[PDB]
Design an enzyme around this catalytic site. Structure first.
Site, PDB file in Angstrom:
ATOM      1  CD  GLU A  88      -2.794  -1.476   0.360  1.00 10.50           C
ATOM      2  OE1 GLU A  88      -3.741  -0.664   0.248  1.00 10.50           O
ATOM      3  OE2 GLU A  88      -2.671  -2.495  -0.357  1.00 10.50           O
ATOM      4  CG  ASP A 142       5.056  14.384   2.454  1.00 11.22           C
ATOM      5  OD1 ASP A 142       5.644  14.481   3.567  1.00 11.22           O
ATOM      6  OD2 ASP A 142       4.195  13.534   2.216  1.00 11.22           O
ATOM      7  CB  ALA A 159       0.336   8.250  -0.132  1.00 11.41           C
ATOM      8  CE1 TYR A 160      -2.814  10.215  -4.294  1.00 12.53           C
ATOM      9  CE2 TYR A 160      -0.525   9.532  -4.464  1.00 12.53           C
ATOM     10  CZ  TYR A 160      -1.477  10.541  -4.437  1.00 12.53           C
ATOM     11  OH  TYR A 160      -1.113  11.862  -4.578  1.00 12.53           O
ATOM     12  N   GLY A 161      -3.288   3.704  -2.231  1.00 17.18           N
ATOM     13  CA  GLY A 161      -4.002   2.430  -2.226  1.00 17.18           C
ATOM     14  C   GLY A 161      -3.134   1.311  -2.717  1.00 17.18           C
ATOM     15  CG  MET A 162      -3.165  -3.159  -4.726  1.00 18.07           C
ATOM     16  SD  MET A 162      -4.112  -4.650  -4.918  1.00 18.07           S
ATOM     17  CE  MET A 162      -4.790  -4.853  -3.254  1.00 18.07           C
ATOM     18  CB  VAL A 163       1.511  -0.064  -5.121  1.00 14.65           C
ATOM     19  CG1 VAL A 163       2.641   0.020  -6.136  1.00 14.65           C
ATOM     20  CG2 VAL A 163       1.061   1.338  -4.697  1.00 14.65           C
TER      21      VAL A 163
HETATM   22  C1  LIG Z   1       6.039   7.650  -4.591  1.00 16.14           C
HETATM   23  C2  LIG Z   1       5.935   6.189  -5.009  1.00 16.14           C
HETATM   24  C3  LIG Z   1       5.852   5.982  -6.512  1.00 16.14           C
HETATM   25  O1  LIG Z   1       5.622   6.937  -7.256  1.00 16.14           O
HETATM   26  N1  LIG Z   1       6.040   4.734  -7.003  1.00 16.14           N
HETATM   27  C4  LIG Z   1       6.077   4.513  -8.449  1.00 16.14           C
HETATM   28  C5  LIG Z   1       7.226   3.588  -8.819  1.00 16.14           C
HETATM   29  C6  LIG Z   1       7.239   2.393  -7.934  1.00 16.14           C
HETATM   30  N2  LIG Z   1       7.946   1.233  -8.212  1.00 16.14           N
HETATM   31  C7  LIG Z   1       7.760   0.367  -7.252  1.00 16.14           C
HETATM   32  S1  LIG Z   1       6.736   0.867  -5.960  1.00 16.14           S
HETATM   33  C8  LIG Z   1       6.542   2.369  -6.775  1.00 16.14           C
HETATM   34  C9  LIG Z   1       5.704   3.507  -6.269  1.00 16.14           C
END
Ligand SMILES: *CCC(=O)N1CCc2ncsc2C1
Length: 338
Positions: free
Chosen positions: A23, A137, A25-29
Site C-alpha cells: 500500500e 513532503d 499513500a493512494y491504495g494498492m500498488v
Molecule cells: C512515490 C511512489 C511511486 O511513485 N512509485 C512509483 C514507482 C514504484 N515502483 C515500485 S513501488 C513504486 C511507487
C-alpha cells in the site's frame, strides 16, 4: 478482470502477471508485465474523498508536465472511456526495486552512496524549484531507487506553487506534511510556501542516511520543534528577532537555554564535508538556509557537480466542487486514451 488480495485490479490486457507490492499513500500498488514495452512496470490504483482527490489531480498535472531523470514520470493512465463509467484510475510508472525508507531500515550506506543519493535528490530538487514548485513532503519513502541506485523523487500530492509573499501565519498552525521532516518555522510562523521548506527535509534525509535513524523523530506537533532545538540549540537573538509573531517569539523565549549538539558528535563516522553541508541545510533561520543550487555547488558534491548537466524546467508551473474535480481528472488523463 484480474484480482489481487480480494480486490479488483483491472489494468486491461496490456498489463498482466500482477504481483502485489504493498500500500502507498493512494491504495494498492502492484507490479505488472507491460506487454507493449516488454518490461515490468509499477501500477497504483486510485479509487474515489475530495482531499485524496485534489492530491490525485495535483500529482497527475505536475508529473505529466515534468520531465527529469530524478523525478518519477507517468507512463500511462488507465480509466474508463467516459466520465459516467469512470471509477478507478490506474497510474503506470517505471518499476523501482526499492526506496530510501526500505533501504535505510536494512542497509548501511557507504559514504559514496550517501554522496550519490544526495546529489540525485538535489539535482531533481533543482528542477522542481526551477518550475516554482515545492514538493513539501520529501522523506525517504518518496525517494525511489532502482537496482543500480538511480534515484527518482515521487509523490507530488502535497506540492504547491511557491508563494513566499503569503508564507506567514500564526504560532501552532496545523500542517499536512510528514512530521519528522518539517522545518522548525512550520511550527512557528510558516505555511511552508517557500523553497527553504524542502531544503530542511533534504537536510533531515542526509542526517538519516548518515546514521540510519531519523534525526528529529517528534511524537506530536510541538515535540517536533523541541527535537530540533535539542540538537541546534537555542536560536540566537538575531534569529529570534526575525520572528515577528509574538506568540511564536515568546514561546521560544520561555524555553531554557539549550546547547548545540556538534554534528561530529552525533555523526562520528561522517565525512567532514557532508557535515558542513548538513549544517547549512539544517539552519534554524530559513533566510540563512542554503538554496538548492548552492547545495549542489558544495565541496561535498564536487565529484558530481556539473551545472550544465543539472537541467531546469522550460517554464514556471501554473496551477472546487466534487463534480468539477472528477471532470478535471478525466480531462487531464485524456492523452492516454485510444
Ligand atoms: C512515490 C511512489 C511511486 O511513485 N512509485 C512509483 C514507482 C514504484 N515502483 C515500485 S513501488 C513504486 C511507487
Amino acid at each position: 478482470p484480474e484480482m489481487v488480495r480480494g480486490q479488483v485490479f483491472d489494468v486491461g490486457p496490456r498489463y498482466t502477471n500482477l504481483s502485489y507490492i504493498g500500500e502507498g499513500a493512494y491504495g494498492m500498488v502492484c507490479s505488472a508485465y507491460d506487454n507493449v514495452n516488454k518490461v515490468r512496470v509499477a501500477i497504483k490504483k486510485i479509487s474515489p474523498h475530495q482531499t485524496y482527490c485534489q492530491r490525485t489531480l495535483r500529482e497527475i498535472k505536475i508529473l505529466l508536465r515534468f520531465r527529469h531523470e530524478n523525478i518519477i514520470g507517468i507512463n500511462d493512465i488507465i480509466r474508463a472511456p467516459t466520465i459516467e463509467q469512470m471509477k478507478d484510475v490506474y497510474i503506470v510508472q517505471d518499476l523501482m526495486e526499492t526506496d530510501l525508507y526500505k533501504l535505510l531500515k536494512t542497509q548501511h550506506l557507504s559514504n559514496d552512496h550517501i554522496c550519490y543519493f544526495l546529489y540525485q535528490i538535489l539535482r531533481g530538487l533543482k528542477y522542481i524549484h526551477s518550475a516554482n514548485v515545492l514538493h513539501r513532503d520529501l522523506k525517504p519513502s518518496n525517494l525511489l531507487l532502482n537496482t543500480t541506485c538511480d534515484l527518482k523523487i515521487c509523490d507530488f500530492g502535497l506540492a504547491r506553487v511557491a508563494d513566499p509573499d503569503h508564507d506567514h501565519t500564526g504560532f501552532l498552525t496545523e500542517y499536512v506534511a510528514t512530521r519528522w521532516y518539517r522545518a522548525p518555522e512550520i511550527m512557528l510562523n510558516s505555511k511552508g510556501y517557500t523553497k527553504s521548506i524542502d531544503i530542511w527535509s533534504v537536510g533531515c534525509i542526509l542526517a538519516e542516511m548518515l546514521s540510519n535513524r531519523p534525526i528529529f523523530p517528534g511524537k506530536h506537533y510541538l515535540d517536533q520543534l523541541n527535537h530540533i532545538l535539542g540538537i541546534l540549540g537555542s536560536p540566537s537573538q538575531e534569529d529570534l528577532n526575525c520572528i515577528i509573531n509574538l506568540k511564536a517569539r515568546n514561546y521560544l523565549l520561555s524555553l531554557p537555554h539549550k546547547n548545540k549538539v556538534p554534528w561530529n558528535r552525533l555523526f562520528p563516522n561522517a565525512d567532514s564535508k557532508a557535515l558542513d553541508l548538513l549544517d547549512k541545510m539544517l539552519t534554524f533561520n530559513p533566510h540563512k538556509r542554503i538554496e538548492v543550487e548552492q547545495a549542489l555547488a558544495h565541496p561535498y558534491l564536487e565529484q558530481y557537480y556539473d551545472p550544465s548537466d543539472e537541467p531546469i524546467a522550460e517554464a514556471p508551473f501554473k496551477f472546487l466542487p466534487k463534480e468539477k474535480l472528477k471532470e478535471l481528472i478525466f480531462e487531464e488523463t485524456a492523452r492516454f486514451q485510444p
